[PDB]
Design a binder for these strands. Structure first.
Ligand code: NA
Ligand code: NA
Length: 324
DNA sequence: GTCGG
DNA sequence: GCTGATGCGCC
DNA sequence: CCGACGGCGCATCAGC
């Protein structure tokens, strides 16, 4: 693509700041910069040129000046041939292994997957599973596979109880041809913000989906949220399917559509809707849409029956998931 | 690191 | 055994 | 010149 050399350099740096430096805000900055530049419709020929783009500053422009001049960045070279740093990056690719655990591991000489398998006694549950499915988790999910995944979930949840209301979100709902994980939202008439009845609502669904061997592993579970692994059924003539990440999320009925809206992405679209709404006199978040008082003071959550209503409130014309 | 009060 | 801090992954 | 930049659910460990 365009300025892919630059956008790579920046992402490489972002990851360095998160994993090795533990400097999360520099990480976000570098990302921001990589994403703008990736959107830019010309080949950048100077640092100064880039700078005009919001999120690019003194330091990144100068690093852009150097890459273009020399084809490479001297700081990055240095880092790629630092054993501690590269090893620490690598480890964090395992789900369950963040910068903290990565650093500790490498301090006691554990640097590779091999070293990890050798030491499964030193990993919690999550990490063990991440280890188990390392490659399968880096694979993308073509849209076809998703559809089969959906129907099963939808069916299985129907079987449990006919009043459950599952929606699948993420890229998939927007129509993207491949998606990273599977986010599922869940709700039921018996569950509202006020009417918090007995749980096991989420449990019995998880239970069911284990029972038809669609779910194969649990990374975390609780009253409202589940994270695990799942696998499409083996066609048997052919090669068994790769294991995927699944999240299921139980949300009160009075907050579903705000949940759906939020979790259907993207980062940018929400930030823009939240910013538009902000000045039109409403604050919306994961859970509710609330009007602001004359004084700039949130009143009460407005009722919501659909994604549409949230667009009504701010008089913004509807934008189907397709176009967000 | 970049931005904005 | 408890409660609160922190790590981790997530629009 | 200097703080904000996302806030949350669950698992785990530190401190008592
Ligand atoms: Na700029
Ligand atoms: Na990780």
């Amino acid at each position: 693509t365009l300025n892919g050399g630059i956008t790579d350099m920046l992402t490489e740096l972002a990851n360095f700041e998160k994993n090795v430096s533990q400097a999360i805000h520099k990480y976000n900055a570098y990302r921001k910069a990589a994403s703008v530049i990736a959107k830019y419709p010309h080949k950048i020929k100077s640092g100064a040129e880039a700078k005009k783009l919001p999120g690019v500053g003194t330091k990144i422009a100068e690093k852009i000046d150097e890459f273009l001049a020399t084809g490479k960045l001297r700081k990055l070279e240095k880092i790629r041939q630092d054993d501690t740093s590269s090893s620490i990056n690598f480890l964090t690719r395992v789900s369950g292994i963040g910068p903290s655990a990565a650093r500790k591991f490498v301090d006691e000489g554990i640097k590779t997957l091999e070293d990890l398998r050798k030491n499964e006694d030193k990993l919690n549950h999550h990490q063990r599973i991440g280890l188990k499915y390392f490659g399968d988790f880096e694979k993308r999910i073509p849209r076809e596979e998703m559809l089969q995944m959906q129907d099963i979930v939808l069916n299985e949840v129907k079987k449990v109880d006919s009043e459950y209301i599952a929606t699948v979100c993420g890229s998939f709902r927007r129509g993207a041809e491949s998606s990273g994980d599977m986010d599922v939202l869940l709700t039921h008439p018996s569950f509202t913000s006020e009417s918090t009845k007995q749980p096991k609502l989420l449990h019995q669904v998880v239970e069911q989906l284990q029972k038809v061997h669609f779910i194969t592993d649990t990374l975390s579970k609780g009253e409202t949220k589940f994270m695990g692994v799942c696998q499409l059924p083996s066609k048997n003539d052919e090669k068994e399917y790769p294991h995927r990440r699944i999240d299921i999320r139980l949300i009160p009925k009075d907050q579903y559509y705000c949940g759906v809206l939020y979790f259907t992405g993207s980062d940018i679209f929400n930030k823009n809707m939240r910013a538009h709404a902000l000045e039109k006199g409403f604050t919306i978040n994961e859970y509710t849409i609330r009007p602001l008082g004359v004084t700039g003071v949130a009143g009460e959550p407005l009722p919501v029956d659909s994604e549409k209503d949230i667009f009504d409130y701010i008089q913004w014309k509807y934008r189907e998931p397709k176009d967000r």
